[PDB]
Symmetry: D2
Amino acid sequence: KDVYILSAVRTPIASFRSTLTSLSAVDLGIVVTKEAIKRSLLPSSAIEETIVGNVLSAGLGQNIARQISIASEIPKSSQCVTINKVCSSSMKAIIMGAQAIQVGYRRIVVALGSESMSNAPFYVPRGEIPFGGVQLVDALQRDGLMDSIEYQPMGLCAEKTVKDYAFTREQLDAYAIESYRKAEHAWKEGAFNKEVVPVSVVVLTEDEEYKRLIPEKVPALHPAFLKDGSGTITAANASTINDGAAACVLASGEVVQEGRLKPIAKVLSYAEAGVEPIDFTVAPALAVKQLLSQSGLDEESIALWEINEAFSVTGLAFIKELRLDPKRVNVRGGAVALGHPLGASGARIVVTLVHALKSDELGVAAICNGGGEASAILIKKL
Amino acid sequence: KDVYILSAVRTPIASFRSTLTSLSAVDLGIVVTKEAIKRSLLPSSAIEETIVGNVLSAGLGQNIARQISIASEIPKSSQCVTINKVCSSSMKAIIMGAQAIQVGYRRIVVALGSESMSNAPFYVPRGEIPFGGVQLVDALQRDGLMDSIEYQPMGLCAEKTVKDYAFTREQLDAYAIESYRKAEHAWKEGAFNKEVVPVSVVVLTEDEEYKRLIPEKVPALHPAFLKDGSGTITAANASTINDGAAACVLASGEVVQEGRLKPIAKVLSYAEAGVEPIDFTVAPALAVKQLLSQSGLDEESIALWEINEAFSVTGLAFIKELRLDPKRVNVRGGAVALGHPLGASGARIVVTLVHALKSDELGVAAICNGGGEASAILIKKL
Amino acid sequence: KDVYILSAVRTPIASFRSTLTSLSAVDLGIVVTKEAIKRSLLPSSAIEETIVGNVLSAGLGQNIARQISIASEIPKSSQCVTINKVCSSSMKAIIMGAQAIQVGYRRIVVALGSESMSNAPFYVPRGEIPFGGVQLVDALQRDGLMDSIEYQPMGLCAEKTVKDYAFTREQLDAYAIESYRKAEHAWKEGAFNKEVVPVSVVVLTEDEEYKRLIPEKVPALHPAFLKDGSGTITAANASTINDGAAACVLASGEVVQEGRLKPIAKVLSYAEAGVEPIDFTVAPALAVKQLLSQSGLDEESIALWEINEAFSVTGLAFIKELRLDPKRVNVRGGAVALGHPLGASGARIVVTLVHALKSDELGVAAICNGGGEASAILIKKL
Amino acid sequence: KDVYILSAVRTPIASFRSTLTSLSAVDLGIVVTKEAIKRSLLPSSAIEETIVGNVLSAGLGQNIARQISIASEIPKSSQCVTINKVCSSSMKAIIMGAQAIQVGYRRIVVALGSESMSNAPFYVPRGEIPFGGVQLVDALQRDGLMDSIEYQPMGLCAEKTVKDYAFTREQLDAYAIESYRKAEHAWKEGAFNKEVVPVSVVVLTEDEEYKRLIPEKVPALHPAFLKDGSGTITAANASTINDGAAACVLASGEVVQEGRLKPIAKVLSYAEAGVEPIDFTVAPALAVKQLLSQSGLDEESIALWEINEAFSVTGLAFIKELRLDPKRVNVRGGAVALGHPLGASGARIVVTLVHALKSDELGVAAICNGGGEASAILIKKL
Ligand SMILES: CC(C)(COP(=O)(O)OP(=O)(O)OC[C@H]1O[C@@H](n2cnc3c(N)ncnc32)[C@H](O)[C@@H]1OP(=O)(O)O)[C@@H](O)C(=O)NCCC(=O)NCCS
Ligand SMILES: CC(C)(COP(=O)(O)OP(=O)(O)OC[C@H]1O[C@@H](n2cnc3c(N)ncnc32)[C@H](O)[C@@H]1OP(=O)(O)O)[C@@H](O)C(=O)NCCC(=O)NCCS
Ligand SMILES: CC(C)(COP(=O)(O)OP(=O)(O)OC[C@H]1O[C@@H](n2cnc3c(N)ncnc32)[C@H](O)[C@@H]1OP(=O)(O)O)[C@@H](O)C(=O)NCCC(=O)NCCS
Ligand SMILES: CC(C)(COP(=O)(O)OP(=O)(O)OC[C@H]1O[C@@H](n2cnc3c(N)ncnc32)[C@H](O)[C@@H]1OP(=O)(O)O)[C@@H](O)C(=O)NCCC(=O)NCCS
């Protein structure tokens, strides 16, 4: 009842209202589910559960996990569930899949995330519209980017963490520009060629966001969330809104043995942490401290880190708190350069981690989410 | 790592655009979470996870499970997730909570469901509106009541099951009227007084739907889903749209022992089944066959049954397939009379089952969902 | 080329979202056009032009005057135009009809107004909706009740006139309550029985608004437009939003002679005035001063007055400025009690004036409109 | 009480959602009103009335004629009215201005039309949205381009006229391509330089639509309105939707004499006709027959014609019915090439006619409108 990763794939990540606009989160979920099954070397008939992270579910139909599963030729007998833990959604999906295996209920599952922020709608409230009209509510704002407890944007919340660490505009901007550099370098060298599956639309084969940097504009931008003169977070050093999906097939040790399989990684452990909503940016290091403690490891044991870059400060805070070598963190770039399709990013950083690790190396992927939580997973590359 | 139910409570179920309109799914979720914690006799500080079923999540904010948890004074360190398995959502929530305990990850969790169908919005699509305009999409239809694979209403799908069993309008209507009779009788005798928690708005203390039956109108209604002359399902013998919530606190055997607690029930087993989307109505008996097989039980072992009444045919098919005594099924009425707040109904039928069972009796609660799946749980009353 | 009124009829005036909701402005316009033609004793084939006042034209189709004309069996060869002078619209319609006759172009026309404020829609702007959404604009506000030059409600503007005359809450409220008294008395005594035509929907036969007064509530209301403590205008002493229509058939002296007709009144003269938008409330007395001057008359020559009661202050200011006997003004009540369907009110007060006048008496009807204008007409009852 | 044209100006006509999108119909109306006043050589204080044609008035505020008048520094005492006769609206405006002068009521008026089809909104109906949602109605369709009596597009109606004259796709397309040729030639030679006033936005100085012809695509297009195989009208041989405005200052003979003015043209006569809505395309020749009859003229008396090109068939039918020399008709191109801002086109073709005529020449401008009417005016160039 050990947990192995058989496959780990992702779409390229597209910009908002760009190349993937005509494809739904269901469509993208089918792309990565089908390809993850193909690369797992198991038939779709062997997949027992489909677990899908998705945040902006409005307008997509009943339980998109079931739509994806059926369209991916997974048996009607297999169980399908869609889950929402904001940015952590598809990391939670992977953790749920691991748990199902750990407890002996399942042998083989597919865990993924998919998000089409391009197709998030606007809301008209139920019940008659009063004299004077009403605001059309943006799903992206209300259900995606605004903290619902503090009733302010996650980027305004993150400014608190900026101040708490005495970070500067200069550091946030340098971090962002370096995320773009690493992403550009990775694409130039073909470093994403093991993990990216092309999406027919005529075909998207490369991430879009990293090409959009206008360097000379970065110091000219005005703070986007805090405008009292002390602001630091801008459109350039915050992640963007994006479309994409990512998937892993998980299988038990028994399946691996019986099938003579060659899994690509092993899930060793996971941890979850929670803090005040406003402080969500520092939850990942808390989850990692728990992860390493329970695993009898320390930071130096870990070859590579993925910390999802909700904002540049997310990366900086993580690196500073855990006293990491920055050169071992997000080595192929992170979401500030690659984009952040909310429901997909949890699985997306696990996919990137798996394929950056060399054999026998340990990696940690960690992600925060609006509301004050974070999830982390420890993996060993085989 | 046995799984006990410490508490099981629900709101009254309100009609569409009625007494609970001013309360959100978050508000209702807080009501039942707070009261479930109170009746568990554990402090809110002991709750380790909050797992919430919800289908129509549009406009409600980030991850309503986290909103509910925080507003219920559960620690910021506790983990919160919202899940969508259409009508099965909060049965899945309970199963997830049981699994977390089974695997030794958690000791104490709260599992619930909440749905405010009154506040489900309409959708305007992203991107510019073409010449000629566009349809405003109803969340209730698109994300709640329409099967997304067959692209037709669940009630049209259920007509297939009607034909497959050779059920008649006469049987469907008699079943419906009897669900209302049992609900009315239960409320007259106070049978829901252990489980219902009143909701301040001036206060809702009783289910609303069961009072709305107009008997003489039932045979006069025209089929609502199939109009070719062979239709049988009507507004009266189908469940309605509704607002409500239901919650259980679950705890491990270790917690019970250490705390000298008196749990009210034990979760013995669960099962999940899946079939073709159009055949969703017959999935519950399939789940129960699995449940009983793996538990070494047969149908006669079971004192009481709850089968969620998506439609009258749901109950009839279940009873016929499993050859049950109808007098042991939904003894206090079912959703055709009580209402069907989608995300809440899974937990709601577990709550009703728990409090109808007498000590040492075994009960089964089963629920189907759009897309072709069903979930079932076996419980022992203590 | 003298101008005679052959007929003058109106619908009852219905409250907002009340009995006439299912009828469009076109439907109501057809009712009064058909009945005005009937009572003119001329065939519909003789009507040469149809001139219709209407303010909230959104969603009603092309040129509602043509829709009304065709559906009223007026020849396809007859000319149809819809005009907007806000509250003055159908007084302008009558003036246009008189001018067409005066200049010898036409012999016979129908001039009317129709407004269904119940069916005024909300607006979604053209072009893609930005991040964060957009306000749904209320047609009633934007195109009806807000002054577009001052960008504030007409009721806020009218507070300036209140201050300029040193009027008091006490006077405004007493005026309002008296408008209701006169309307109630008129309906009790059958005084509207010559002019009102019933509207089949099962039938509306009486004005609705005047029955809605709650006397004891009037001094308890808070100012609706000005909230700095100096406000005086409230929901009770302002006119309401309403549905209704009114129509007159006009004919030349030549037609009357050739047809041996018995016209009910003669149009002697008209005048139009304009002032600053904020001062629109005092434009009617300015128009009347011009009207009387050019006609060689003085105020004492005039038996009865109709001053459209946009607000109670409209009536008070008019009476004070012209030094009128209040008992000769709006003797059957005015729009504060009867309602104010914007596009219809100009013709509606001419209809009420015509039928309150006794033979050989002179009457003046005057009406202000948002933007700072007013229209007045002098008539002689035959 | 003769009627003279002192000035006649227009904006360039912009394409839908193009260069003038940021300008409202009020903004464009102010541009042409101010410039018409400037070129009339009278001060704005002398303008006694402002009469404005406009069809799609939704969202624009109260009585746009008053907004335009005030913003153009015309006295608050001057009278302002907005009128809707669909495509004929601003020809009707000019006729109303002429009548006001003819009857001796006014000496000096400005008559214009303005339309911003780019800013026509969508409509949400009043009252609560039913289960299943509702269609968002396009103002352009419902209030502009659909005949409201036949409940079909004006282009489908026009196919009847195509059949009645045995016109062919080949003739309609050749006519369209020639309208574009004449427009292109006119702009190349500077023929619109007397009438066009540039619009600051950085500035629009030339009509946009005529540049958009793709010749080789014209025979490839499918009929847009009638798809049973007998259709002939396409996007290329129908007019387009557009933004623009046009204005004339009119003055009496007395004003001209007293002011020592040099008017540019004289309005000799006007006529109006009406037919069945479906037959609206043949109303213009009917109006012209009346115009010429009452004026003691015949077709050969007329140097130049403007027939508004709602469709290519509009021009062809007019030319055929009146047996005109095509080389004297729309000599600088017509609306199929220049665009058709509905409320503006009536005045726009009068402006183009005035400035194409040489001194002492007679011209006729004629325009049809949805609903079955047409207006025509006879002018003499001075
Ligand atoms: C509304 C939203 C779409 C921003 O609106 P937008 O118009 O797309 O913002 P832009 O990308 O155009 O950026 C604003 C300006 O910054 C500039 N800019 C943005 N990214 C840049 C980069 N990487 N380099 C240089 N300049 C950049 C743009 O050129 C733009 O133009 P301007 O400076 O001339 O005004 C916003 O939702 C978003 O993209 N991100 C929100 C941040 C966030 O919370 N993300 C979620 C992670 S949890
Ligand atoms: C749209 C929706 C709200 C139905 O619209 P509705 O207007 O509320 O339908 P009504 O409740 O008014 O019922 C229609 C008619 O049946 C009658 N009716 C409904 N329930 C009745 C009952 N229990 N007894 C007698 N008559 C009943 C009503 O009087 C109504 O009036 P009418 O016969 O004079 O026309 C629909 O979404 C719904 O309620 N249920 C859908 C069924 C479904 O799939 N439910 C989800 C379970 S998965
Ligand atoms: C938005 C609009 C509909 C007002 O909203 P509304 O909800 O209908 O306002 P109401 O009629 O309910 O009045 C508000 C309160 O005053 C009271 N009220 C209104 N008219 C009253 C009367 N004649 N006597 C006693 N009380 C009255 C109501 O009871 C109401 O209840 P509350 O005091 O318990 O709060 C507004 O557009 C309107 O009706 N008139 C605007 C005034 C105006 O400019 N009219 C146009 C003329 S140019
Ligand atoms: C909805 C509306 C905007 C048409 O939609 P649209 O997308 O703008 O239509 P288009 O201009 O793109 O034309 C459709 C196609 O014809 C082609 N086309 C249009 N005008 C053309 C021209 N002058 N030459 C060659 N091709 C042309 C376009 O290239 C387009 O592309 P496609 O052939 O590759 O599909 C419509 O309202 C309209 O423009 N006119 C309606 C006609 C009408 O009644 N006008 C009112 C006068 S009363």
